[PDB]
Structure formats: structure tokens, C-alpha cells
Amino acid sequence: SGVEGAAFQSRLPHDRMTSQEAACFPDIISGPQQTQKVFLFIRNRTLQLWLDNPKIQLTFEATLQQLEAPYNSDTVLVHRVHSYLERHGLINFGIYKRIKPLPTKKTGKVIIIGSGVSGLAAARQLQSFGMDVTLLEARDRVGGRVATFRKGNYVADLGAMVVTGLGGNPMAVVSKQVNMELAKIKQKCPLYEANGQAVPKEKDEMVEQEFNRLLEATSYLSHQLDFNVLNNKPVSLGQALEVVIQLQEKHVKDEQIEHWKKIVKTQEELKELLNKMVNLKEKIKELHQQYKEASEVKPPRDITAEFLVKSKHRDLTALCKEYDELAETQGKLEEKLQELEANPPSDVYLSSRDRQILDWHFANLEFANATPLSTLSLKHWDQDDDFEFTGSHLTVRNGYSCVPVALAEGLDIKLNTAVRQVRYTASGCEVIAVNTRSTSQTFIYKCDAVLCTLPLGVLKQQPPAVQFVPPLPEWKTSAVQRMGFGNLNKVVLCFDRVFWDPSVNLFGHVGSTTASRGELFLFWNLYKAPILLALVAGEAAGIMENISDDVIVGRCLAILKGIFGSSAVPQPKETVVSRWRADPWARGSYSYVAAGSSGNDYDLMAQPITPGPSIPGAPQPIPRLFFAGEHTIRNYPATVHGALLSGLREAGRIADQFLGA
Amino acid sequence: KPPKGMFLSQEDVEAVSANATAATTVLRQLDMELVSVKRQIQNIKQTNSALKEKLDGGIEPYRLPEVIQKCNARWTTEEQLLAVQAIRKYGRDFQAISDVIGNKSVVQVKNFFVNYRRRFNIDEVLQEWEA
Ligand SMILES: Cc1cc2nc3c(=O)[nH]c(=O)nc-3n(C[C@H](O)[C@H](O)[C@H](O)COP(=O)(O)OP(=O)(O)OC[C@H]3O[C@@H](n4cnc5c(N)ncnc54)[C@H](O)[C@@H]3O)c2cc1C
Ligand SMILES: Cc1ccc(-c2ncc(OCC3CCNCC3)cc2-c2ccc(C#N)cc2)cc1
């Protein structure tokens, strides 16, 4: 349906009110089931009208005229719903034309640290809501971890690059507003081993499926066998995979021992049979000689002598019958041995060539999770997976910077302003910052409220890059230490001519050792001008940063020349190498559910901080220090959309505080 | 509920994770158990290969030709005397005795038992067999 789809695109159940809706409409959720449906239809239909055209502000007046009877009869109900959606950023968010020009009477002062997407989105909302908002950005540009390299015809994102489906993604709304150009990714990914020859089909698939099996194996290991703690430390996805593999190697050896033990069992029966036949043959040989001697007492003989011949003859053919039976038994034993000698179970679980291609799939996983698998929480690493968007993953062909730039239009941003100290008290807040170009120039910003979108890497820093006065409470810092902030990097290679396969967007480089598996493991074609990106993941990420650009581009051209031939790989006209862990305004790439952590930690991060009373005995102050950013959104971490949502969230929360709901 | 061809017993997991060096000890132990089974095979193959060489020749130099004798119901003084000696040697074995005489069915022989029981001291003869 279309009304139902609007709910799904708003990441909302269509036939049920949410906890957040319960909070604002508790008369209705505790009320009769009929009014619940009316509420629900108004909510879904308002979402639909906004979604059906996100380039214009959807006003309450507009919404009411568009409702049919009887839903437009309780106008106060419609008005509550419309304001609810507006406040929480479900409608009229991103970049739209305003019908009502913004009122000049601004209320409240908010200082926003960082103009990443989380910071930018919050700012735009707070401005929409009529507050005074100023952003402080340490870098000389907007966008934070969304960072597009541009030089001549060449365009290539050093930061975010993928929209992980449009079904339920707010970036689907944004992209209608910003008219950015999205493009699908062809799934075919030929892997070339270090020799530069490709991996044949039989083996690429045999291993990818084995990799997928080993994953599910750890999940069973996790959920069904309660194997989440080992020697008082939390088990990691890495250790689980290692244990799973060892168990497959164990079981392969088990099958061999069972199989060769069927052979000794049968050979030993044969040994006993042969012994019976050899002792029977000697007994027969002796008996025949006796019959021969008795048979040569030529007649006429008396009856005992006749008995002896006839007797021996009987005894002899009896034993020959026994022997013939034993040798028919020997036939059917000797062929059971030819049977087992021809169905020997699998020789090895994985070969060194195999285990290397396996390592490639691990690197691929290490890449999209931006951390070594030894660090992912076995129990909780995939928890954000229940909220995958639907539809194809897309890339931004024209450069993802188009979004944060468009978002910054009309906002008051102070670039080259590194915050050093955040002071929050009962009466308000002071943010101290310096000019990054000239750190002797000091700036004091007084404000009602501070919204912090500092990267989790930055909060993690020791010694601190930003000091909080007073210090963040333990429950917040401890979550900061617990969570994982990871790392990936790219090498942009700009050539003048395409030498790769144009109908192929991905191909891989298989590392020769488990350790080197993340080192330049994937090559990515996706832009109009001839550009290959080269990805670095896992334990390789951190190590590659202490290597010079020229050497890295050497390792790249070396790998490529192995695949396409020395005669076909020209020198790049322009190159760029990201080093995200060393970027002091990032201190890594994005968060990851570290072992020993959980998604509850992501919630702790979003909890605002409330100072204590200036004067003692004074009423409970209001919260003053707020937090957004991809590390603050449980169900959608480590993405642009998660950041955007987190900013939308805090803006709603701050407005509810300082303007009233 | 493990995936197909994955092998994950609660027992084996604890046996591999109980110790820092446990998995390599579990796996190298199985290795040194498979090596000893394989040489046990080799030993038996060669012991057997030696026995098969002794059986070269079958029993064919020793099989007699199978004479058929049309069964007759008339008991000769000769055939009677064979029957006693057959009882002396073979006991209650009606098949063997039928074979030794050559022309008396198993039934005729069992009949011979009670028929001539009194006259040939067939009770006494069966006692002598049990020596
Ligand atoms: C290499 C890479 C690739 C990615 N690819 C994708 C992708 O394909 N798809 C996806 O959905 N997500 C992707 N992400 C994640 C996504 O880019 C981030 O989660 C999100 O964009 C971060 O936004 P944020 O607003 O929370 O923080 P940031 O954008 O990091 O913004 C925080 C801002 O604070 C500034 N700052 C730091 N210290 C100070 C200070 N002392 N004073 C003032 N300002 C300061 C920083 O300079 C920055 O502008 C990627 C991330 C990385 C690193
Ligand atoms: C060819 C290809 C395409 C898509 C992905 C991918 N899929 C999914 C993703 O989910 C986000 C994760 C956040 C952490 N918890 C798990 C989900 C991210 C990524 C991704 C994309 C680009 C970059 C870069 N540079 C890094 C990661 C990778 C490779």
C-alpha cells in the first residue's frame, strides 16, 4: 500500500503506535482501539504527503485540506500529529523550500561542535524551529567523515560512498532534494591470487559458501551453545571462527580414523580367515595322502580296509567343502577391502590455496566492519543487521560531498575552529575554541546548550583533545572506552585510460598470508572518469598508514600489473591515500560493537548530561550537554543515515527542552 | 541446529578451548593416532600377503572326483558292515554315514539304526564312540 509504505519508509510499524508515540499521545495509546487506528492513519497519511514531495514544506494547513472525512474532523488531533512529526524530524527535514519564511524572533542559543552530517542535520532543524544555532568545525570544510576528493575531471569519495539500500533510508528523502546521482553495484567479483591468475569458478564458490557456513557456525556457537565468555574475557567473532575451523579440522581427522579403522577391522578378519584356510589346507593335504595310501591297498580287501578308503574319502570331501566355503568368504571380504580403499574421506579440510581465498572473504568482512575480526563482539557484532534497508546498495557517482554542502546552505558555520574545552553549568554553557591556523587566537562561545558531535575516536583520545568542565560522568566515559572505533582506508588511482573490465565493478586481490589479507584486497570501479579505488582493511589498515604514499601506489601498480600485464598499466595522473586513523579530527573510521560491549553502550552515548545546581538546595537543573553522531544511534551506527537520524533526534530533544513540546 | 556439514558438539568445543595450547594438542594427537593405525594396516597387509602365498595351489591337487551312486534300498552284508564301522567312528551323524556307504539315503540309515539296533549291539557301539 501507499499509506502503509509511508510508515515503512519512515522506519515505522504501520498498524501499531511506537514507544515514542506513546510518550506524546498517552491518552490515545491507553484509549480505545478505534481512536488508535484514526491516529495511525493520520500519522501514516501525513508521512505519505511529505514523502510524496520532500522539496516543499508540508504545513499543518496543507495536511488538513488533504485529509478526507472523517479524519479531518478532530483538527486538534491532526494538529498534534503534524507537530509531532515535524519536531521529531519525520517530515519537513533535509532541504526543502519553506512556505513560511523563518521568523526573525530567534529563541535560545545552541553551539554545535562539528559539522559532520549529524551536526549539520541537527543545526538545520534547530534553525527551522527558530533557535539561534552556530556550528564550530575544526576542519576547513563541512562534511566530517563525508569527504570527496575533486581535481579536474576526477571525483572520488575518500569517506562515505555507499547508500546501504533506499527502503527505509532517510537518504532516499535527501537524494530527492539534492538530486545526487546514485548507481547500482554489479556483484561479480573475480578474485586473482597473488600470482595474478584468477581463481576458477569451482573454487571461488566452494569457498564463499564455506565462508558463509562458518559465519552461521559462530552464530549457532554463540546463541545455542552460550559460548560467549572464555577465561573471564568476552569471546570475539574472530576467536569463534578460529574455534569453528579447528572443529572442522578435528572432524576431518575423525573421519579418517574411523575409515582406516574399518580397514584394520576387516583386514584382521581376513587375517583370521587366511589362518583358518592355511591350517585347513595342510590338514587336507595330509588327509589326501592318507586316502591315497588306503586307496593303494589293492583289493580284494576285508571290510575294515574297505571302510578306511570310503571313510577317508568322506572325511576328505567334507574338509574340501569346508575350504571352498572359506574361500567364498575370502572373496567377499577381499572386495569389501577394495571398497574401502576406493572411498577415502576428505583429505584436508582446507588447503593453503583454499585457506587463502577464505582469508579474502574475512578481509571483505573486516572491511565493511572496519575492524579486525579479533575485536568484534561475538554476541553483538551483527545486532544492527535486523534493520537493514531494502533495495540495492548504491554508490554516489558525483561525489557524496554534494549532501553535506547542500545541508550547510544558510547555516552559520565557523570553520578552522577547534574546540578545546566544553564548560556546562546550571546557568548555561561556555565553549572555548582556537583558530586551527593560529592556535593563539582564542574564542569563547556562550550558549544555552551544547550539542556534541565529536567522533568517538576523538572522545577516545588520550590525552584528551577536548576537555569537559566538569568531567563527563563515569557511566559515559566507560561506555566511551568500551565501544570500538575502527578503521579502513582507500587509495584513489586516477588514470587516463581504462585498462580493467568496464562491465565489472569489483575485483579482488588474494593476500598470501592471513596477516596481509587486508592489504589492498579489493579494487573498485564506479566513477565516470577512469578511476580505480583500492581498499585496505583489517590489521592491514593501521599498518599501511606508516607507509609512504609512493610505496603504497607501488604496491598497487604491482598488484595490477600482475593481473592485467606490465604492458597495460600506465602511471596514475593523480593519486590520493586516506589515513583516517591519523586524521586528528576522526581518529579512525567508524564505530564497531567491540567485544565486551553491546548496543546499550550506543544508547549511553546519546544520553544528555545534566549539570548539578549552582547554588546548593536549588531545583534540578535541565540538561545542558547533548550528543549526536553515528556512535549515538543503536540501530544504525557507522553510517551517514545513522548520523543524520541522530542529529534529527537531538534537535527534537533540544527543542522540546528549550522551546517546550 | 548447526549448519549442514558443520560439526560443533558442546563436548568438542570445551575440549578445544579448555587450554591455550589445547586445539593443536587435540589435532596433533589425532595425527599421531592416524599414523599408528596406518602402519597397523601395512603390518596386516604384509602378514596377509604372506598367507595368500601359502595358499597358492588352492586345494586342487587334493579334490577327489565326485562319484554319484544311484541310491539302492537293499542292504548288503558288505554295506551293513560299513554301517557299523561308520557308527563306531561317526556317532549319530546320519549324513556322514550315508556318505560313507554311498548308496543309502539319510532316512534308510536312521531306519537301519532301530532295525539293526538289537543285533549289532548298536547301543554298545555308540558307547565306544564316546571315548
Ligand atoms: C572511510 C569511511 C567510509 C565510510 N563509508 C560509508 C558509506 O559508504 N556509507 C555510510 O552510510 N557510512 C559510511 N561511513 C560512515 C559515515 O561517514 C559516518 O558515520 C558519518 O558520516 C559521520 O558523521 P558524524 O556527523 O557523526 O561525524 P563526523 O562527520 O566525523 O563529524 C564530526 C565533525 O567534528 C569535527 N571535529 C572533530 N574534532 C573537533 C574539534 N575539536 N573541534 C571542532 N570540530 C571538531 C570533525 O572535523 C567533523 O567535521 C564511512 C566512514 C569512513 C571513515
Ligand atoms: C563493495 C562494497 C559495497 C558495500 C559495502 C558495505 N556494506 C555494508 C556496510 O554496512 C555498514 C556497516 C556498519 C558497521 N556495522 C555493520 C554495517 C558498509 C559498506 C561499506 C561501503 C563502503 C566503504 C568504504 N570506503 C566501507 C564500507 C562494502 C563493500
Author numbering:
A (entry chain A): 172 to 832
B (entry chain B): 309 to 439
Published text:
Lysine-specific demethylase 1 (LSD1, also known as KDM1A) was the first histone demethylase to be reported, and its discovery proved that histone lysine methylation is a dynamic process regulated by methyltransferases and demethylases. However, LSD1 is unique in that its catalytic domain contains an elongated Tower domain where the REST corepressor 1 protein (CoREST) binds and presumably mediates LSD1 binding to a nucleosome. LSD1 is highly expressed in several cancers and is involved in maintaining the stem cell properties of cancer cells, such as those involved in acute myeloid leukemia (AML) and glioblastoma.
In this paper, we present the crystal structure of LSD1•CoREST in complex with 4-[5-(piperidin-4-ylmethoxy)-2-(p-tolyl)pyridin-3-yl]benzonitrile (1), which was recently reported to be a reversible LSD1 inhibitor with a Ki of 29 nM. The crystal structure, which clearly reveals the electron density of 1, shows that each of the three branches extending from the central pyridine ring of 1 is anchored to a separate binding pocket in the spacious substrate-binding cavity of LSD1. The piperidine ring of 1 is located in a negatively charged pocket formed by the side chains of Asn540 and Asp555 and the main-chain carbonyl groups of surrounding residues (including Ala539 and Ala809). The structure depicted in the figure shows the piperidine ring in a chair conformation with the nitrogen atom forming a 3.3 Å hydrogen bond with one of the side-chain oxygen atoms of Asp555. The 4-methylphenyl group resides in a rather large hydrophobic pocket in the LSD1 substrate-binding cavity. The 4-cyanophenyl group sits in a hydrophobic pocket formed by Met332, Val333, Phe538, Lys661, Leu659, and Tyr761 and is located near the FAD molecule, with the cyano group nitrogen atom 3.9 Å from the closest atom (C6) of the isoalloxazine ring. Importantly, the lone-pair electrons on the nitrogen atom form a 2.9 Å hydrogen bond with the side-chain nitrogen of Lys661. Specifically, the side chain of Trp695 changes its conformation to accommodate the 4-methylphenyl group of 1. Although the docking study indicated that the piperidine interacts with Asp555, as was observed in our crystal structure, the pyridine ring in the in silico study was rotated by about 180° relative to its position in the crystal structure, with its nitrogen on the FAD side of the pyridine ring.
